[PDB]
Amino acid sequence: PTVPKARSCPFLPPDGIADIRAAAPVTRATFTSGHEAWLVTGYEEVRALLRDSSFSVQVPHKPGRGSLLWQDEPEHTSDRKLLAKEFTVRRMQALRPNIQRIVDEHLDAIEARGGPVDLVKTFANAVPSMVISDLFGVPVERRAEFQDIAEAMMRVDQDAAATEAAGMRLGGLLYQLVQERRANPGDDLISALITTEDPDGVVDDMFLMNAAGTLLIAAHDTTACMIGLGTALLLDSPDQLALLREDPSLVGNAVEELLRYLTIGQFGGERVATRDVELGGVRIAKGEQVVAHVLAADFDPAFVEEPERFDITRRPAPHLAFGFGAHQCIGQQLARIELQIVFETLFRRLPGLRLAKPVEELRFRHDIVFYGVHELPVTWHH
Ligand X SMILES: c1ccc(-c2cnc[nH]2)cc1
DSSP 68: -
Site for ligand HEM in 324-353 (CB under 6 A): 327, 329-331, 334-335
CB distance 111 to 103 below 8 Å: no
CB distance 379 to 115 below 8 Å: yes
Only one of the segments 138-146, 169-177, 259-267, 295-303 lies at the binding site for ligand HEM (rule: CB under 6 A); that segment is 259-267
Only one of the segments 29-37, 229-237, 250-258, 320-328 lies at the binding site for ligand HEM (rule: CB under 6 A); that segment is 320-328
d(CA 65, CA 71) in angstroms, rounded, equals: 7
Size of the site for ligand X (CB under 6 A): 7
Is residue 110 at the binding interface for ligand X, with CB under 6 A as the rule?
no
What does the longest C-alpha to C-alpha distance in the chain come to? Answer: 62
323 binds, among ligand X, ligand HEM, none (CB under 5 to 8 A by kind): ligand HEM
Only one of the segments 7-15, 24-32, 215-223, 308-316 lies at the binding site for ligand X (rule: CB under 6 A); that segment is 215-223
Question: Which residues contribute to the annotated binding site?
Answer: 76, 80, 269, 271, 327, 329
CB of 241: closest distance to ligand HEM in angstroms?
21
CB of 356: closest distance to ligand HEM in angstroms?
26
217 binds, among ligand X, ligand HEM, none (CB under 5 to 8 A by kind): ligand X
Question: Which residues contribute to the annotated binding site for heme b?
Answer: 76, 80, 269, 271, 327, 329
**Residue placing its CB nearer to ligand X in the complex, 117 or 295:** 295
CB of 22: closest distance to ligand HEM in angstroms?
24
DSSP 186: -
**Residue placing its CB nearer to ligand X in the complex, 42 or 265:** 265
Is residue 189 at the binding interface for ligand HEM, with CB under 6 A as the rule?
no
d(CA 338, CA 226) in angstroms, rounded, equals: 11
Dihedrals phi, psi of 364, to nearest 5 degrees: -100, 155
d(CA 361, CA 365) in angstroms, rounded, equals: 13
Only one of the segments 50-58, 96-104, 213-221, 292-300 lies at the binding site for ligand X (rule: CB under 6 A); that segment is 213-221
Only one of the segments 97-105, 116-124, 202-210, 217-225 lies at the binding site for ligand X (rule: CB under 6 A); that segment is 217-225
273 binds, among ligand X, ligand HEM, none (CB under 5 to 8 A by kind): none
**Residue placing its CB nearer to ligand X in the complex, 221 or 257:** 221
CB distance 198 to 82 below 8 Å: yes
Is residue 131 at the binding interface for ligand X, with CB under 6 A as the rule?
no
What is the number of alpha carbons within 13 Å of residue 146 lying toward its C-beta?
Answer: 25
d(CA 21, CA 3) in angstroms, rounded, equals: 11
Q: Is 238 exposed, middle or buried (0-12, 13-18, 19+ CB in 10 A)?
A: exposed
**Residue placing its CB nearer to ligand X in the complex, 24 or 229:** 229
123, containing H or E segment: none
219 binds, among ligand HEM, ligand X, none (CB under 5 to 8 A by kind): ligand HEM
Site for ligand X in 45-74 (CB under 6 A): 69
CB distance 323 to 265 below 8 Å: yes
354, containing H or E segment: strand 354-355
**Residue placing its CB nearer to ligand HEM in the complex, 127 or 259:** 259
Among 119, 217, 254, 362, binds ligand X (CB under 6 A): 217
Angle, helices 238-246/224-235, rounded to nearest 10 degrees: 100
Is residue 25 at the binding interface for ligand HEM, with CB under 6 A as the rule?
no
Residues with Cβ within 8 Å of residue 361, at least 6 apart in sequence: none
Nearest CA-CA partner of 216 in 252, 255, 245, 173 = 173
Cβ burial 98-128 (10 Å sphere, 16+ → b, else e): ebeebbeebbeebeeeebebbbbebbbbbbb
Catalog residues that contact ligand X under the rule CB under 6 A: 69, 214, 217-218, 222, 267, 329
Catalog residues that contact ligand HEM under the rule CB under 6 A: 50, 68-69, 80, 214-215, 218-219, 222-223, 226, 259, 263, 265, 268-269, 321-323, 327, 329-331, 334-335
